């Protein structure tokens, strides 16, 4: 046969709100993105995943949708969206949109209607329950602070919201609701979108009766929220009624679920979703409370990647990324963002990202080596999630405001949301006004204009890597083997296909290291290296590595 285009594609994630402002209000928009398509095409991007672009009050920057058929006012008009679509097609590029249907905004007409009385036809489009013992219906906590149940004086009942209080969860147990969601998907699919990514797909099915979580379940409530008994039945129904009739690739953001459950969502035979977005790797060093970090090593990094790759089996398929809108900057998180190591570790991480088995997603700015932001106060964070931590940990006295600041500065989602650094003009050329979130001061040295014409820049390294992955089948769809899962200094692995085998070797330490190839394996050619003064000699049986050196080789 032949593998789907998405298996060998290189994606780029665009967080519109922080990509390019074209009208000075401080917020990125569609015209800004459209304006930059040549830039992304020049980088080598085959497809783009854009975060929510629908009408929204923005309590959660797009993830709280008030109208699924209207574009977000801040991003432009439907006309602008259409133009973006057309310009993408002109360049033979594809678009993947985010689909948020676990919950809607509390400003969506379905909710306004639903909440008005106990007897309207939209009551069951959401979850309404009586409280118990003078308290909420049960002990369900919300990811964004306090209880997941909010009382509404109009009826005396509580509505469910796993996330924000203004993000009431939709009721998938109601057939009419499901049908409205399907009609909604076709609306966008009919416009030609090539892919759909489903925000927290594993939480659609709620547990019948809403019994309290046990003390143990309470310790990782996210997991219990992915245990609805009708989850896969709904996902299968959605595929049968919708995707079965289209040519779009589907991807699921499997948030909170144990890795062993992943295959149920992506095994092509099950006819649910095509690709998986998991959190195991990107949160491999994150505490349960989500704002503390736990020390880990390369050994933990690779072993996690090893498990994730393994559950894709023969019929499944994974996405791979080191960054996104919900996590700290890749170079800061996995590399070394100190002035003297930022570029070297950034290039090394790029080598990892583009040689992994699965479909790579490059988050905007990582091609430049962008870092975390130097937050000084809790007020420097815009994120609703941080407010949630304050409510749950500072007001309850479990931690001081300074403790929260110290720790969340390294885990916050806002680290990834500061304006993309185009050049060194005001606000790194992101806007002519005041950015919605402060630009990182390091924009004077880290910016696209400065790296674009520099063949030694992190940008060029990514471009060269993308070019190379595109020309080497084994690097996309080939098998994967970790040479030594327990090694905490150097990450080395092979990718193979149709007799050809490649070797990737990446030094994660800021010191010289050595690597001996597996018995009987020899360097045949060097495809590329970063931070290396000399390529190995043909036939080499070992490698000498500089601090943070990376390389892709064809072996024999
Ligand atoms: O970005 C968030 C968003 O705030 C919510 O709609 C929930 N989603 C699931 C968790 C994932 O990170 C994503
Ligand atoms: Ca704007």
Domains of the chain: 1-104+175-478 (3.20.20.80), 105-174 (3.90.400.10), 479-556 (2.60.40.1180)
Q: Is 385 a catalytic residue?
A: no
- Contact status, residue 109 vs residue 69, Cβ threshold 8 Å: no
Taking the CA of 25 as reference, the closest ligand is 2
Residues having CB within 6 Å of any atom of ligand 1: 60, 63, 100, 163, 199-200, 253, 255, 326
Q: Ligand 1: which of 63, 143, 223, 386 to mutate, judged by most atoms within 8 Å of the beta carbon? A: 63
CA distances for 195 relative to 129, 175, 248, 534, angstroms:
36, 24, 5, 42
Residues 104, 109: Cα–Cα separation, whole Å: 10
CA of 483 to the centre of ligand 1 (A): 35
> What's the token pair of residue 51?
């975060």
38: left (phi over 0), alpha (psi -120 to 50) or beta: alpha
Position in ligand 1 atom list of the atom nearest CA 325: 1
260 marked among binding-site residues:
no
Question: From CA 203, how far away is CA 223, in angstroms rounded?
Answer: 9
- Centre of ligand 1 from the C-alpha of residue 63, in Å: 7
Say which residue the tokens 């924000």 belong to: 164
Pairing of strands 550-555, 523-530: antiparallel
**Cα 200 to ligand 1 centre (Å):** 6
- Nearest-CA residue for ligand 1 atom 3 is 63
Q: How many CB atoms lie within 10 A of CB 296?
A: 15
Ligand 2 midpoint to CA 25 (Å):
5
Question: Which of 379, 388, 435 has its CA nearest to residue 409?
Answer: 379
The values of phi and psi at residue 198, to 5°, are -100, 110
Ligand 1 atom with the smallest distance to the CA of 100 is 6
User: Angle between the 175-190 and 231-241 helix axes, to the nearest 10 degrees?
Assistant: 40
The helix (run of H) or strand (run of E) holding residue 333 is: helix 330-334
Report the nearest-CA residue for atom 1 of ligand 1. Answer: 326
Sign of CA dihedral 189, 226, 313, 476: positive
Look at residue 147 and give its three-state secondary structure: strand
Of 199, 272, 285, 326, which residue is the catalytic one? 199
Phi/psi of residue 62, nearest 5 degrees? 105, -30
In this structure, the residue with its CA closest to atom 6 of ligand 1 is 63
User: Is 29 known as a binding-site position?
Assistant: yes
63: Cβ contacts below 8 Å, ≥ 6 apart: 52, 56, 100, 163, 167, 199
Tokens found for residue 468: 């190379």
Q: Is 396 helix (H, G, I), strand (E, B) or coil?
A: coil
Beta 500-507 vs 490-497: how paired, if at all?
antiparallel
Distances (CA, A) of 424 to 14, 346, 436, 447, 451: 21, 20, 18, 7, 11
- Protein residue with its CA nearest to atom 13 in ligand 1: 199
Cβ atoms of 452 and 40 within 8 Å: the answer is no
Q: Are 454 and 484 in contact (CB under 8 A)?
A: no
Which residues place a Cβ less than 5 A from the ion ligand 2? 21, 23, 25, 27, 29
Catalytic residue chosen out of the listed positions 253, 272, 383, 392: 253
Contact 356, 316 (CB under 8 A): no
Question: Which atom belonging to ligand 1 lies closest to the Cα atom of 385?
Answer: 4
Residue nearest to atom 12 of ligand 1 (CA): 326
Task: Work out whether strand 149-152 and strand 157-160 pair parallel, antiparallel, or are unpaired.
Answer: antiparallel
For residue 444, the 8-state DSSP code is: G
Identify the three-state secondary structure at position 530.
strand
Q: Which of 75, 74, 76, 54 is nearest to 65 (CA)?
A: 54
Active site residue 199: yes
CA distance 169 to 148: 10
The protein residue with its alpha carbon nearest to ligand 1, atom 9, reads 200
Q: Which ligand is nearest to the CA of 19?
A: 2
**Sign of the alpha-carbon torsion through 239, 242, 247, 252:** negative
The angle that helices 342-353 and 458-471 make with each other, rounded to 10 degrees, is 20
Helix (H, G, I), strand (E, B) or coil at 250: strand
């Amino acid at each position: 046969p032949g593998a789907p285009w998405w298996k060998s594609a290189v994606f780029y994630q665009v967080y519109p709100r922080s990509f390019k402002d074209t009208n000075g209000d401080g917020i990125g928009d569609f015209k800004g993105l459209t304006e930059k398509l040549d830039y992304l095409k020049g980088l080598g991007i085959d497809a783009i995943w854009i975060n929510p672009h629908y009408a929204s009050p923005n309590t959660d920057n797009g993830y709280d949708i008030s109208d699924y058929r209207e574009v977000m006012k801040e991003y432009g008009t439907m006309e602008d969206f259409d133009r973006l679509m057309a310009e993408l097609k002109k360049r033979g590029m594809r678009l993947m949109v985010d689909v948020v249907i676990n919950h809607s905004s509390d400003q969506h007409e379905w909710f306004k209607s639903s909440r008005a009385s106990k007897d309207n036809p939209y009551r069951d489009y959401y979850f309404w329950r009586d409280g118990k013992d003078g308290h909420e219906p049960n002990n369900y906590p919300s990811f964004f602070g306090g209880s997941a149940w909010e009382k509404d004086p109009v009826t005396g009942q509580y509505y469910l919201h796993y996330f924000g209080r203004q993000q009431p969860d939709l009721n998938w147990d109601t057939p009419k609701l499901r049908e409205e969601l399907y009609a909604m998907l076709r609306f966008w699919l009919d416009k030609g979108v090539s892919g759909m990514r489903f925000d927290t797909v594993a939480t659609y099915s709620k547990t019948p009766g809403f019994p309290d979580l046990t003390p143990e379940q309470m310790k990782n409530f996210a997991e219990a929220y992915t245990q609805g008994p009708n989850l896969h039945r709904y996902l299968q129904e959605m595929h049968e009624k919708v995707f079965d009739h289209y040519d779009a690739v589907t991807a699921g953001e499997i948030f909170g679920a144990p890795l062993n459950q992943v295959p149920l969502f992506i095994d092509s035979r099950r006819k649910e979703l095509d690709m998986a977005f998991t959190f195991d790797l990107i949160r491999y060093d994150r505490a349960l409370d989500r704002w503390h970090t736990i020390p880990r090593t390369l050994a933990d990094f690779r072993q996690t990647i090893d498990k994730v790759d393994a559950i894709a089996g023969e019929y499944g398929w994974n996405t791979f990324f080191l960054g996104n809108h919900d996590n700290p900057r890749a170079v800061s998180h996995f590399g070394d963002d100190r002035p003297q190591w930022r570029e070297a570790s950034a290039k090394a991480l790029a080598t990892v990202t583009l040689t992994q088995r699965g479909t790579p997603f490059i988050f905007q700015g990582d091609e430049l080596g962008m870092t975390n932001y130097p937050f000084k106060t809790l007020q420097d964070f815009d994120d609703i999630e941080v407010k949630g931590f304050f409510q749950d940990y500072v007001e309850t006295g479990k931690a001081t405001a300074e403790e929260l600041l110290t720790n969340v500065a390294l885990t916050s989602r806002d680290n990834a949301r500061t304006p993309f650094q185009w050049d060194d003009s005001a606000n790194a050329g992101f806007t002519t006004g005041k950015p919605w979130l402060k630009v990182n001061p390091n924009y004077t040295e880290i910016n696209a204009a400065r790296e674009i014409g520099d063949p030694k820049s992190v940008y060029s390294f990514y471009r060269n890597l993308i070019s190379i992955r595109h020309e080497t089948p084994a690097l996309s769809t080939g098998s994967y083997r970790d040479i030594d899962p327990s090694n905490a200094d150097v990450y080395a692995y092979t990718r193979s296909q149709d007799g050809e085998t490649y070797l990737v070797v990446v030094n994660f330490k800021a010191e010289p290291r050595s690597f001996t190839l597996p018995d009987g394996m020899h360097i045949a050619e060097t495809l590329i290296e970063s931070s290396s003064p000399a390529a190995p000699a043909a036939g080499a049986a070992s490698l000498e590595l500089q601090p943070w050196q990376s390389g892709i080789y064809k072996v024999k």
